[PDB]
């Protein structure tokens, strides 16, 4: 039986599993009034990926495909391939192509092309996940660009940079988009998570994304960092119980700072009340202690 | 009871470039006798020691943070960047590294997006280029210069740079095997990771190759790394003791259950194969590298 | 007509040192054959061109502003330097270092102060070792040392210079310039060294005795020209008719001249005197421009 | 007849005339509910110093004198004050207090330093409480407070001002003159108070934000004219042809005029503005004299 382990990583050595950016802080909040069903960064403790989660850190909210013709007022239609470059099969039991953004808003980035004659071009672009032509489950999506310099029918890649909404309220990180437009409803979704113990809230790995304009704070929370996605997938260690007891330890000090539950479906809960950051020392790290049952009472923070 | 050395089980489509935040596109071998191979990113020993400017975060390779200002003296607008380490400290040049971790390790222009968020929460982001051959590219001294087409940048504001691809006009301006001058022309490069080369007849370096995006021109954007970023992270975590200077590795197809080729994974973090000429090494989509055994340096690899 | 050259009418007790924010204490002459006098603050041409790290504000000499981050005065702090603007200093300007940067080897003693966005404040004594390997002002940073640990990181910090803070006198070398870029590169864009170009002449200095936080340091600091002359020449920019302006120290009570001196175009004075000696002046006397002369003019001794 | 001129100075090239710090901004405000009578930085346009105003930028809120013992900043010390030039202070002089005495109520935070005949030196943080009953500089003495007990009695002592040192913001009152003679008598020989005298006009202030040793004090200090103007007018002594000089802030980058103001004979400015508000100026702009004018001039609103 292979033991369960966490990688030894510092707050500044973790990457967001819903975006190609580093983790900036730890955060907690009540979550009764939101649905926490993100589809990227979703993995079980025994290394089973769920939702649209994949392994490549740079490919979260990115895409590959072929461009066609349809202030960012130039509209382009993207026929989506898999991030392999292999053709995307909508019949596959997944909500959308792996790496598809799992929130409502506009993903700001750069679309680039390389033609057979070796000519190239790349310009800023936005992916509106709220538009009726955001149908990646059907195999296509729409980008908008400020530039007209794009050649139709050429292979196109998208590099995510941050959020590109105009008003803060258009970015809702806890509202899944319609992966099929309004043709049909979302399917094959990774389960939604919630704390299930009195006085416990979710613990989030928080990033602040770049913003192309407006006053969007670009706050994106993920349940588990991308390195844990990659680590559990490699290890595939059998989950002994539903809950893993984890502790944040300071190697400078020897002291433990707080304890937490790491649940089998891939999320963390702590004993705290209110929307608040969790300030941690620069050398601290999460450490696996043992398998424990859901009725464990954590020391409050 | 000696902790065994391992490679993560990753297919070709599951690896990331360690010199740029992009997926690996192919495997490639090439003669390098006439060139010096000394990249500074993606440099790790098999027992988990990072070298050069290598760090763990995949997105921070060729990215930077700091404070933007207008420079003292078609991408026209010039901006000066006082460089911060990732934690938000200013970069202290007294540290024994060639440059801030993740600083580009090639000659050319890095094309990306510079973004700002002001204390009153106003934001902006526009395309930008980092010329690593500019005389004001002195990251070791704590500064660099970006070029932009837009003028919408507030000075004295925190600024991030996300790298997307090459930005040179003429393909020959991108020299992936030519180091930049980390201190400009004021002093020489320091604390470099050592250069690598095959030390056996009939052997060539094996590269993990990516085709970076390009903002224009005919640049193929070819970037070779010695080792994927996932092996950098894995070896750092494992730190398994290196039994010898060479680890024998085999590329196995798990459906066939048969090895396609074998290679030497050297202790300093680079691979060699028994092959002559510049050529891609095509592999099945489910194949992956596997550690076979520690060997002596004079082990003879099967050809190809 | 041609705009005439003038000196401000100022008494000895109405002049400020141009290398430190203190009043001028006395006049002094000294043989300088075996040293290189090349100070960077208080460097101005007679026709109003500033040189070195010289600027106009008297309080900003050996002061600085920036952001403090962490790194018996035993607490070390990293200072990311800003211009008086608030924006980081650009190392690409053709100056030796940020304007006002100290131009001597030793420790500057002062007070570092902070004011945070929530309006909370703190201030404590600090020292600036201009010989430290981490004194890299030209690169945009330096290292302060404090006895108090009460300093918030990532907060705007000012430094008010008070005086010397060396332990033994020999650490203070007023005529030894620091390495503005640490040991990464050598000093550049320096104002030229100065020396008398005539037999029997010595440099004339405006001398101040800086406060000292401890030890036996005399705190002696000599500037070539007071800060008021820096500000005056910059405003007037009168054309220099020759390389030497004859200048006379006059007593307005008695109407008599006490001595004469050469005010050179590069911005320094020489007198016909031998040996290390103070120059005693009446409390109401002052320098006054007499005429432009040729370099081979012979000053009356003393 | 010598014409009246202003020095060509930028916002960032001006010093506060009530404290040895640079000017940070321009400000305006209604002043009906305060007495604007501040004694430092008081000069007439024809070059006459008033109040406790002197020439040296570093000596505002500073003192020289002899220290002796008397009775957290625990240690109390008595200062027998000399003049800033080391000359004995005469309380019969027709001035409010020794030149450079603070002209506000609060605590001046700085460093007291000593150098002894045997060349031993000390320097530590110190505060001058101008509201204390033993703050009697007109009588020739004040009291400092220190946290360090390392001071030698009967030794020459200097004081370098750094900023404010009150605990609560309300202790610092920049528009309340201290009692230069304690409560033994009232203030004498004061520079006159100023106020706008035209409809829609308010005073224009040169504003700095002083460092603070603690608490949440904003350390905001307003002066009527910058110290460089005090020095320039003293040098020029140009005849004031009328009571009001018309002055315009011009942008050399664009050649355009941004606002105009009245510069009054007693040394203060008024603008056509309403409400407490900063006056934002471009970095290269400067004040330019236009002509002499009468008090009934109507300024263009801002």
Numbering used by the authors:
A (entry chain A): 224 to 293, 308 to 538
B (entry chain C): 223 to 295, 308 to 538
C (entry chain D): 223 to 293, 308 to 538
D (entry chain B): 224 to 294, 308 to 538
Can you list sentences taken from the study reporting this PDB entry?
NoVs recognize specific glycan ligands as host attachment factors or receptors for infection. NoVs interact with HBGAs or other glycans through their capsid protrusions that are built by the dimeric protruding (P) domain of NoV capsid protein (VP1).
The TV24 P dimer exhibits a typical NoV P dimer global structure. The two P proteins also share the small T-loop with an α-helix extruding out of the flat surface (Figure 6(C–F), Figure S3). The TV24 P protein bound secretor positive types O, A, and B human saliva samples weakly with optical density (OD) readings up to ∼0.4.
